[PDB]
Amino acid sequence: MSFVKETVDKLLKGYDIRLRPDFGGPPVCVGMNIDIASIDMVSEVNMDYTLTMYFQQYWRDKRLAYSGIPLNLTLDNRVADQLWVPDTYFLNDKKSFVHGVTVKNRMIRLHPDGTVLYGLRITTTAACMMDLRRYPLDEQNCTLEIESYGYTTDDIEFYWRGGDKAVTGVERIELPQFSIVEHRLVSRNVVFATGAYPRLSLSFRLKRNIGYFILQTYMPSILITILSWVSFWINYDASAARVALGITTVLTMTTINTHLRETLPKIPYVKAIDMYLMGCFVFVFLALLEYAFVNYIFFGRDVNAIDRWSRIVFPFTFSLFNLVYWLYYV
């Protein structure tokens, strides 16, 4: 152990963390690969998702070349504070941390040719602007932006180490509400007035699972709307029966609508689900108004015709509304 101990002390002695590898020479190429552990949460209210991953950085530093040891030195995580590491950050990251139990979840692995592998276990909440107009039939594209903070492409370059295979573990992701449809790796240079800055982007496309809203939201609303049509098959003189049915469906629809507002998130603008609930509320509102016109045109002043035509138009117009709705959203 003494030989390796003196080997390591040799490396750090005279090391300058303030200078990048190949300082003043060609830019240092840093390869990156990510092993995704999980996407714990995806919140529409905050418009962000929580991601756990193993974030690996891979580059070459000639100052760390060691000879005589035919092994790849896996060192304690505390040695990472004494080496140079890239100033990588996540552009859209709202809050993040490195796990610290039992020790800090950090890894440093050296190789004889001076190649450094640097891994971190990170949980990060990354900002994801979402277009929830088609919610719950929406498809989201949430990204992770990787950039250098204070270096340009004259000093540091980024690439996905392994091409399109640089990211693995996507099949491990188990989101109850979404399914990972696709993921992409993008490497690009961002040019500002101050220069060009390396950029890596990891993006996922999420498709929301609709089955819950079919059973929980759409089917009850469809069944209540159908139930409101039972009025059309009752006698015009059954005022107590037809008003109680019509007004209680309105109350039932409001109960469904108002209480659904509580289980569903606080997204304060019109979405696809809002338009369907508002569509069904108008239909049940009109069914109650339909009997009032029948009741008034009889006692205040044909009658069988209005009920006959309502028995067809209301189911037909609701089917047409659904056809226009699902085509415009599916």
């Binding site: 950050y89 709202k94 990060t124 900002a127 204070g150 008003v243 809002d274 009889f298 006692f299």
Partner: protein
């Protein structure tokens, strides 16, 4: 690489970071600009908002001049904490985060002239007091003020790097608001006096306007259609007492369900807003419709309605004939007065 290493060591030789530049000699002039990456969510309940910024400060420190092959030096996060930087803070901040993942998201650059550019990536929660009397048709100018915590204007003065309008820049995709529209911003500066002295304050106001389409479809339209529905009862015959009692009472219950849920969205404030008054009027209209029928029923004589063929029958209530016009009209007038006032 030796030349670069030597310059760094020589810079901090005798440098005292406890003393501002020109202490006792002149006034330190700090030039600031902000780049808003994302104007985060606004919380009406907490009366605060989040903003993600690149906070750039620029000032001159003659003690950090240098000469060498390069003209710009990048200082390590450890080096930045070794020198004097402005003790800038946000007056209305509630809890702010200087991101430290994976490394500190700071950057200190020094030019040979002695000018320092100092940028940091921040997430700031700021206090935005709101007057919610016009809610949901309210507009707010959420402020963002900063200055020196300890240095008076006789010691440190802040200025915008360029024309105040162009010194604060919002990224094109930076609007992360759900219920607001970022109309624009006004950038100002001034002096604020407190118990410890006069301080310079740089202020930026973001003018927000609440989107109303949500509350129109969630609150206003259901309330309007229930009030109309409660008035639809006026067109039923006066002899259907069970039907018109069920009709009127369940519309009161519908208003109660709507009113309860409508106030859940509102922040828990103890005063009345523009939506509370609208609901209170709708409550009074729905209440009066059931009181209207109670008066009609008092003057009903025969318990049977018109048979439809022809024995005498009740006449259409004169209360009903008037209420079919007065109730819609009064609600119609109220809506015009209500909407013209707040819109």
């Amino acid at each position: 690489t030796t030349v670069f290493t030597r310059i760094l060591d020589r810079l901090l030789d005798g440098y005292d970071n406890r003393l501002r530049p020109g202490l006792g000699e002149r006034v330190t002039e700090v030039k600031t600009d902000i780049f808003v990456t994302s104007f985060g969510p606004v919380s009406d309940h907490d009366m605060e908002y989040t903003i993600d910024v690149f906070f750039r400060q620029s000032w001159k420190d003659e003690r950090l001049k240098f000469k060498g092959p390069m003209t710009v030096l990048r200082l390590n996060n450890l080096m930045a904490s070794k020198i004097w930087t402005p003790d800038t803070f946000f007056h209305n901040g509630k809890k702010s985060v200087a991101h430290n993942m994976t490394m500190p998201n700071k950057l200190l650059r020094i030019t040979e002239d002695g000018t320092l550019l100092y940028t940091m990536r921040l997430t700031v929660r700021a206090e935005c007091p709101m007057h919610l009397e016009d809610f949901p048709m309210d507009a707010h100018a959420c402020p963002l003020k900063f200055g020196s915590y300890a240095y008076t204007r006789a010691e440190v003065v802040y200025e915008w790097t360029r024309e105040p309008a162009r010194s604060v820049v919002v990224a094109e995709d930076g609007s992360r608001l759900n219920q607001y529209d970022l109309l624009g911003q006004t950038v100002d500066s001034g002096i604020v006096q407190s118990s410890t002295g006069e301080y310079v304050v740089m202020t930026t106001h973001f003018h927000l306007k609440r989107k109303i389409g949500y509350f129109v479809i969630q609150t206003y339209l259901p309330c309007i259609m229930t009030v109309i529905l409660s008035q639809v009862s006026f067109w039923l015959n006066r002899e259907s007492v069970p039907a018109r009692t069920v009709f009127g009472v369940t519309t009161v219950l519908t208003m109660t369900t709507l009113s309860i849920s409508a106030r859940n969205s509102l922040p828990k404030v103890a005063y009345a807003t523009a939506m509370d008054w609208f609901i209170a009027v709708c409550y009074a209209f729905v209440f009066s419709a059931l009181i209207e029928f109670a008066t009609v029923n008092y003057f009903t004589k025969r318990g049977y309605a018109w048979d439809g063929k022809s024995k005498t029958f009740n006449s259409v209530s004169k209360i009903d004939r008037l209420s079919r016009i007065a109730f819609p009209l009064l609600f119609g007038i109220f809506n015009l007065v209500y909407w013209a006032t707040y819109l």
